[PDB]
Amino acid sequence: WKKNTPFLYDLVMTHALEWPSLTAQWLPDVTDFSIHRLVLGTHTQNHLVIASVQLPNKIEIEIKINHEGEVNRARYMPQNPCIIATKTPSSDVLVFDYTKHPSKPDCNPDLRLRGHQKEGYGLSWNPNLSGHLLSASDDHTICLWDISAVPKEGKVVDAKTIFTGHTAVVEDVSWHLLHESLFGSVADDQKLMIWDTRSNNTSKPSHSVDAHTAEVNCLSFNPYSEFILATGSADKTVALWDLRNLKLKLHSFESHKDEIFQVQWSPHNETILASSGTDRRLNVWDLSKIGPPELLFIHGGHTAKISDFSWNPNEPWVICSVSEDNIMQVWQMAENIYN
């Protein structure tokens, strides 16, 4: 694979980190080259990490913040990207404003968020209501907090609402991109559930489909279409969904030869979606080419399970993917391949 790269990439960078990261997300600020930044974590003292990346038109660690337990997931708040929520290996979800913490570390989170009885990974900030955070847990619950309602000197926040519709481990949660009340969740009970926070019944979802034939592990809403979202599963399938007819699956993307953990739409291209998991492959899909023609690219760079990945928001087709052997890769498939 390493020998074949000039054929398949316009860019590939490999970085062995000192510790594995379970988490990867590009921050939205970019400053011959340009400087981009990634939110990462450690697994096995733990830190919340901000790294720098030079990209054309080196990777340095900029910020390490003491974290209790590994960082299961870390997500920046869209309305103030200095704010980062993290999932811990305990019931706690933590919140850090990276500017209120030392350059190098000495765990003293800015907020500790209560309401779960077990650890999880799923985590999602509302991009339409500032400080509304959702978290999914192995306890079968989804918790909601409004951190914007928390007093200046408040360090502890109880869950505003707990959603209980699921009957198994809740794997992932994600807000809708346009509708401030609407989010989706996926769980081990094989369901996708669409929830409406304006509803008083926190035990029953607005809609509910039996999405998959095994555990549903991830979901992602389309940033270009109000109606479209995708799920990924222990099914080894990515399923496609329309909010106007949830009961029938629009499509199935086959396939990974193993369990799917992440699915994310492109921020630049409405027909483009990527997925990954335990087969150590990150696949890029093209809706438009359905009628496997919809498989546009297989990224074979990783030699361990891929933990998370993120589409760079400033630089089309750039992806950061991180694996369980400590490897972070920043890569862009060849222009020849998408156009």
Short mmCIF file of C-alpha atoms in Angstrom, two decimals:
data_model
loop_
_atom_site.label_atom_id
_atom_site.label_comp_id
_atom_site.label_asym_id
_atom_site.label_seq_id
_atom_site.Cartn_x
_atom_site.Cartn_y
_atom_site.Cartn_z
CA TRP A 1 0.00 0.00 0.00
CA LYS A 2 2.80 2.52 0.97
CA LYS A 3 4.47 1.97 -2.43
CA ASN A 4 1.12 2.61 -4.31
CA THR A 5 0.32 6.02 -2.63
CA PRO A 6 1.28 8.45 -5.50
CA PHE A 7 -1.37 6.62 -7.59
CA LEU A 8 -4.18 7.15 -5.10
CA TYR A 9 -3.38 10.30 -3.07
CA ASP A 10 -2.79 13.96 -3.62
CA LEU A 11 -1.72 13.90 0.03
CA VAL A 12 -0.82 11.38 2.73
CA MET A 13 0.92 12.10 5.99
CA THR A 14 1.49 9.56 8.75
CA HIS A 15 2.10 10.38 12.37
CA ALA A 16 2.64 7.96 15.17
CA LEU A 17 1.34 9.72 18.25
CA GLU A 18 2.84 9.00 21.69
CA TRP A 19 -0.52 7.46 22.68
CA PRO A 20 -3.50 6.15 20.73
CA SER A 21 -6.35 8.60 20.15
CA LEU A 22 -9.89 7.26 20.21
CA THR A 23 -11.05 10.61 18.88
CA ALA A 24 -10.37 13.03 16.02
CA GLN A 25 -12.06 16.28 15.00
CA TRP A 26 -10.79 19.26 12.99
CA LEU A 27 -11.33 22.62 14.65
CA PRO A 28 -12.92 25.12 12.22
CA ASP A 29 -10.14 27.83 12.27
CA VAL A 30 -7.38 27.79 9.61
CA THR A 31 -4.41 30.16 9.95
CA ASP A 32 2.65 28.88 1.10
CA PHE A 33 1.12 26.51 3.72
CA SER A 34 -1.87 27.00 6.08
CA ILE A 35 -2.21 25.91 9.73
CA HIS A 36 -5.15 23.65 10.70
CA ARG A 37 -5.84 22.15 14.12
CA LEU A 38 -7.18 18.86 15.47
CA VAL A 39 -8.88 17.97 18.74
CA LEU A 40 -7.44 14.59 19.84
CA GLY A 41 -7.24 12.53 23.02
CA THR A 42 -5.06 9.93 24.66
CA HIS A 43 -5.95 6.40 25.60
CA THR A 44 -3.79 4.98 28.50
CA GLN A 45 -1.85 10.30 32.68
CA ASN A 46 -4.44 11.01 29.96
CA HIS A 47 -4.75 14.29 28.09
CA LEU A 48 -7.12 16.23 26.00
CA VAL A 49 -4.91 17.36 23.15
CA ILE A 50 -4.93 20.13 20.56
CA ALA A 51 -2.56 19.52 17.66
CA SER A 52 -1.39 21.75 14.84
CA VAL A 53 -1.09 20.59 11.15
CA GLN A 54 0.54 22.45 8.23
CA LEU A 55 -1.32 21.84 4.99
CA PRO A 56 -0.58 23.15 1.47
CA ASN A 57 -2.91 25.55 -0.39
CA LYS A 58 4.71 19.02 10.45
CA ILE A 59 2.28 18.18 13.27
CA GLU A 60 2.93 19.76 16.66
CA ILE A 61 1.10 19.25 19.95
CA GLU A 62 -0.02 22.71 21.15
CA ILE A 63 -2.16 22.00 24.21
CA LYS A 64 -2.26 19.05 26.59
CA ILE A 65 -4.93 19.15 29.31
CA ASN A 66 -5.09 16.59 32.11
CA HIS A 67 -8.10 14.32 31.57
CA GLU A 68 -9.45 11.67 33.99
CA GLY A 69 -9.35 8.33 32.16
CA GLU A 70 -8.98 8.01 28.41
CA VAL A 71 -10.84 10.47 26.18
CA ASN A 72 -13.59 8.28 24.58
CA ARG A 73 -14.69 11.22 22.40
CA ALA A 74 -14.07 15.01 22.30
CA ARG A 75 -16.19 17.57 20.34
CA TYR A 76 -15.81 21.32 20.08
CA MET A 77 -18.81 23.63 20.57
CA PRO A 78 -19.69 25.23 17.17
CA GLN A 79 -20.68 28.57 18.87
CA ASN A 80 -17.37 28.79 20.82
CA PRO A 81 -14.79 26.22 19.54
CA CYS A 82 -12.60 26.85 22.64
CA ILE A 83 -15.26 24.78 24.45
CA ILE A 84 -14.75 20.97 24.16
CA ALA A 85 -16.92 18.26 25.72
CA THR A 86 -15.45 14.91 26.39
CA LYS A 87 -16.71 11.42 27.09
CA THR A 88 -14.82 9.69 30.02
CA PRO A 89 -14.57 5.95 30.92
CA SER A 90 -16.85 6.80 33.86
CA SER A 91 -20.45 8.18 33.97
CA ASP A 92 -19.13 11.77 33.71
CA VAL A 93 -19.13 13.96 30.60
CA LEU A 94 -16.65 16.79 31.05
CA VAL A 95 -16.32 20.29 29.51
CA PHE A 96 -13.15 22.26 28.99
CA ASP A 97 -12.50 25.77 27.77
CA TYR A 98 -8.89 25.22 26.57
CA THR A 99 -7.99 28.87 27.19
CA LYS A 100 -8.62 28.59 30.94
CA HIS A 101 -5.95 25.83 31.27
CA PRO A 102 -2.06 25.75 31.43
CA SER A 103 0.17 25.61 28.34
CA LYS A 104 1.59 22.27 29.49
CA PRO A 105 -0.36 20.16 32.07
CA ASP A 106 0.41 19.88 35.83
CA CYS A 107 -7.89 17.06 36.03
CA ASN A 108 -9.93 20.10 36.79
CA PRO A 109 -12.66 20.35 34.16
CA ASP A 110 -14.57 23.58 33.74
CA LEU A 111 -17.88 21.67 34.06
CA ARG A 112 -18.70 18.19 35.18
CA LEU A 113 -21.94 16.99 33.62
CA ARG A 114 -24.05 14.51 35.60
CA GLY A 115 -26.97 12.30 34.62
CA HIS A 116 -25.49 9.05 33.28
CA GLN A 117 -24.87 5.88 35.23
CA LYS A 118 -22.43 4.44 32.64
CA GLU A 119 -19.68 5.45 30.11
CA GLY A 120 -20.41 5.94 26.40
CA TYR A 121 -19.02 7.53 23.21
CA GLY A 122 -21.88 9.39 21.46
CA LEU A 123 -21.74 13.15 21.80
CA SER A 124 -23.23 16.06 19.86
CA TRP A 125 -23.55 19.82 20.37
CA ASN A 126 -26.58 21.62 19.01
CA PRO A 127 -25.40 23.91 16.21
CA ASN A 128 -28.64 25.97 16.50
CA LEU A 129 -29.06 26.36 20.32
CA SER A 130 -25.86 27.37 22.04
CA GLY A 131 -24.60 24.93 24.68
CA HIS A 132 -27.15 22.16 24.13
CA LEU A 133 -25.20 18.95 24.38
CA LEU A 134 -26.40 15.41 23.93
CA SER A 135 -24.62 12.32 25.21
CA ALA A 136 -25.25 8.62 24.60
CA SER A 137 -24.39 5.97 27.24
CA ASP A 138 -24.01 2.18 27.88
CA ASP A 139 -26.82 2.78 30.43
CA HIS A 140 -29.47 2.95 27.61
CA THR A 141 -30.10 6.69 28.20
CA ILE A 142 -29.48 9.89 26.27
CA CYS A 143 -28.70 12.93 28.45
CA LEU A 144 -29.27 16.58 27.46
CA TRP A 145 -27.62 19.55 29.15
CA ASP A 146 -27.95 23.18 28.47
CA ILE A 147 -24.55 24.54 29.64
CA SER A 148 -25.61 28.06 28.59
CA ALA A 149 -28.10 28.08 31.50
CA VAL A 150 -25.25 27.33 33.95
CA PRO A 151 -24.15 30.24 36.21
CA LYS A 152 -20.66 31.71 35.51
CA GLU A 153 -19.14 29.99 38.61
CA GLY A 154 -21.15 26.74 38.25
CA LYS A 155 -18.89 23.70 37.90
CA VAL A 156 -21.52 20.93 38.07
CA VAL A 157 -24.53 20.50 35.79
CA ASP A 158 -27.44 18.15 36.09
CA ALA A 159 -29.04 16.70 32.98
CA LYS A 160 -31.82 18.89 31.74
CA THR A 161 -33.58 15.85 30.21
CA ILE A 162 -32.98 12.14 29.98
CA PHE A 163 -34.38 10.28 26.95
CA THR A 164 -35.23 6.65 27.71
CA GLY A 165 -36.79 5.20 24.51
CA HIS A 166 -33.95 2.71 23.89
CA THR A 167 -33.76 -0.81 25.43
CA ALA A 168 -30.01 -1.39 25.01
CA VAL A 169 -26.63 0.42 24.93
CA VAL A 170 -26.95 3.79 23.16
CA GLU A 171 -24.11 3.99 20.68
CA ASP A 172 -24.42 7.40 19.05
CA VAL A 173 -26.47 10.58 19.18
CA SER A 174 -26.52 13.50 16.71
CA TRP A 175 -28.49 16.74 16.44
CA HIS A 176 -30.22 17.67 13.20
CA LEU A 177 -28.38 20.50 11.36
CA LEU A 178 -31.38 22.77 10.73
CA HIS A 179 -34.13 21.82 13.23
CA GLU A 180 -33.15 22.89 16.76
CA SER A 181 -35.59 20.37 18.40
CA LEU A 182 -34.68 17.34 16.41
CA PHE A 183 -32.02 14.72 16.97
CA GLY A 184 -31.36 11.12 16.12
CA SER A 185 -29.98 8.29 18.20
CA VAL A 186 -28.89 4.74 17.44
CA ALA A 187 -28.49 1.83 19.83
CA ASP A 188 -27.85 -1.90 20.35
CA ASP A 189 -31.61 -2.62 20.15
CA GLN A 190 -31.14 -2.14 16.33
CA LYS A 191 -33.16 1.08 16.21
CA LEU A 192 -32.69 4.54 14.87
CA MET A 193 -34.91 6.95 16.82
CA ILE A 194 -35.78 10.50 15.86
CA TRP A 195 -36.41 12.66 18.89
CA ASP A 196 -38.17 15.97 19.37
CA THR A 197 -37.07 17.91 22.46
CA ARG A 198 -40.39 19.87 22.41
CA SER A 199 -42.15 16.62 23.31
CA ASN A 200 -43.00 16.06 27.00
CA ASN A 201 -42.86 12.26 26.66
CA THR A 202 -39.11 11.55 27.06
CA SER A 203 -39.70 7.80 26.83
CA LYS A 204 -41.02 7.79 23.24
CA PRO A 205 -39.29 9.06 20.07
CA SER A 206 -40.97 11.18 17.37
CA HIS A 207 -40.13 8.41 14.91
CA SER A 208 -38.50 4.99 15.25
CA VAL A 209 -37.18 2.47 12.64
CA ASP A 210 -35.57 -0.97 12.98
CA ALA A 211 -32.50 0.27 11.11
CA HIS A 212 -30.23 -2.77 10.99
CA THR A 213 -29.80 -6.52 11.68
CA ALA A 214 -27.30 -6.00 14.52
CA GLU A 215 -26.04 -3.09 16.71
CA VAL A 216 -26.35 0.38 15.15
CA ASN A 217 -23.12 2.17 15.94
CA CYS A 218 -23.16 5.56 14.34
CA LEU A 219 -25.35 8.04 12.52
CA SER A 220 -24.73 11.19 10.56
CA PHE A 221 -27.14 13.86 9.21
CA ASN A 222 -26.53 15.38 5.69
CA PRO A 223 -25.44 18.99 5.91
CA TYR A 224 -27.03 19.82 2.53
CA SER A 225 -30.40 18.05 2.78
CA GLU A 226 -32.86 18.40 5.66
CA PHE A 227 -34.25 14.93 5.11
CA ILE A 228 -31.28 12.69 4.64
CA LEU A 229 -29.15 10.87 7.21
CA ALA A 230 -27.05 7.69 7.35
CA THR A 231 -26.40 4.88 9.83
CA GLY A 232 -23.58 2.35 10.22
CA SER A 233 -23.78 -0.99 11.85
CA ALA A 234 -22.32 -4.24 13.16
CA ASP A 235 -24.33 -5.23 10.01
CA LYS A 236 -21.13 -4.21 8.11
CA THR A 237 -23.59 -2.00 6.15
CA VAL A 238 -24.19 1.71 5.83
CA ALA A 239 -27.92 2.34 5.43
CA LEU A 240 -29.37 5.54 3.88
CA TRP A 241 -32.59 7.21 5.27
CA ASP A 242 -35.10 9.91 4.38
CA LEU A 243 -36.99 11.65 7.24
CA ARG A 244 -40.06 11.81 4.97
CA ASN A 245 -40.33 8.00 4.67
CA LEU A 246 -38.21 6.50 7.52
CA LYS A 247 -39.95 3.12 7.38
CA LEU A 248 -38.26 2.19 4.08
CA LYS A 249 -34.43 2.23 3.74
CA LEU A 250 -33.42 4.22 0.64
CA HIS A 251 -30.19 2.31 0.10
CA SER A 252 -27.57 0.02 1.68
CA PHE A 253 -23.81 0.48 1.11
CA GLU A 254 -22.08 -2.82 0.92
CA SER A 255 -19.52 -3.33 2.16
CA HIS A 256 -16.92 -3.30 4.80
CA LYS A 257 -15.83 -6.84 5.64
CA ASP A 258 -16.32 -5.95 9.34
CA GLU A 259 -18.16 -3.92 12.06
CA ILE A 260 -18.81 -0.19 11.29
CA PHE A 261 -18.02 2.43 13.96
CA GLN A 262 -18.03 5.79 12.20
CA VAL A 263 -19.98 7.38 9.42
CA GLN A 264 -19.66 11.04 8.38
CA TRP A 265 -20.96 13.08 5.49
CA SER A 266 -18.65 15.35 3.51
CA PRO A 267 -18.89 19.05 4.50
CA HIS A 268 -18.27 20.02 0.89
CA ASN A 269 -20.23 17.59 -1.29
CA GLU A 270 -23.82 16.46 -0.62
CA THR A 271 -23.54 13.08 -2.39
CA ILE A 272 -20.34 12.06 -0.50
CA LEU A 273 -20.13 10.01 2.71
CA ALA A 274 -17.31 8.09 4.43
CA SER A 275 -17.35 5.19 6.86
CA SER A 276 -14.92 3.10 8.92
CA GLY A 277 -14.35 0.51 11.60
CA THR A 278 -12.77 -2.76 12.62
CA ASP A 279 -11.72 -3.91 9.10
CA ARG A 280 -9.06 -1.14 9.26
CA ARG A 281 -10.62 0.40 6.12
CA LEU A 282 -12.06 3.83 5.61
CA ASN A 283 -14.43 3.74 2.60
CA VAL A 284 -15.65 6.83 0.71
CA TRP A 285 -19.10 6.51 -0.88
CA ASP A 286 -20.80 8.44 -3.70
CA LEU A 287 -24.68 8.46 -3.75
CA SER A 288 -24.74 9.86 -7.26
CA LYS A 289 -23.09 6.73 -8.67
CA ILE A 290 -25.74 4.26 -7.40
CA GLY A 291 -27.14 2.48 -10.52
CA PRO A 292 -20.19 -1.46 -6.26
CA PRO A 293 -20.18 1.80 -8.32
CA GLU A 294 -21.07 3.90 -5.23
CA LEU A 295 -17.77 2.86 -3.60
CA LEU A 296 -15.52 5.74 -4.72
CA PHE A 297 -12.31 5.08 -2.71
CA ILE A 298 -10.92 2.60 -0.16
CA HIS A 299 -8.27 4.02 2.17
CA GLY A 300 -5.92 1.20 3.07
CA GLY A 301 -3.43 3.27 5.07
CA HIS A 302 -4.25 1.87 8.53
CA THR A 303 -2.94 -1.40 10.06
CA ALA A 304 -5.14 -1.33 13.25
CA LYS A 305 -8.89 -0.66 13.79
CA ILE A 306 -9.77 2.96 12.85
CA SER A 307 -11.09 4.68 15.98
CA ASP A 308 -12.51 7.93 14.53
CA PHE A 309 -12.03 10.20 11.51
CA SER A 310 -12.85 13.80 10.52
CA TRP A 311 -13.37 15.57 7.18
CA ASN A 312 -11.34 18.78 7.10
CA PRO A 313 -13.92 21.68 6.99
CA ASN A 314 -11.59 24.17 5.18
CA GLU A 315 -9.87 21.91 2.60
CA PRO A 316 -12.02 19.69 0.40
CA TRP A 317 -11.42 15.93 0.50
CA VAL A 318 -8.88 16.12 3.32
CA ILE A 319 -9.57 13.60 6.08
CA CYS A 320 -7.91 12.93 9.40
CA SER A 321 -8.29 9.32 10.50
CA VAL A 322 -6.78 7.81 13.72
CA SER A 323 -6.18 4.10 14.57
CA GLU A 324 -5.61 1.98 17.73
CA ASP A 325 -1.86 1.46 17.04
CA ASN A 326 -1.17 5.19 17.71
CA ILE A 327 -1.30 6.22 13.98
CA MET A 328 -2.84 9.46 12.85
CA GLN A 329 -3.03 9.96 9.06
CA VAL A 330 -3.95 13.12 7.16
CA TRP A 331 -4.78 12.31 3.57
CA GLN A 332 -6.49 13.39 0.48
CA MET A 333 -7.40 10.99 -2.32
CA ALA A 334 -6.19 11.98 -5.82
CA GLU A 335 -8.12 14.67 -7.72
CA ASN A 336 -8.10 12.27 -10.71
CA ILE A 337 -10.47 10.04 -8.66
CA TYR A 338 -13.27 12.49 -7.61
CA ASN A 339 -13.37 14.55 -10.82
#
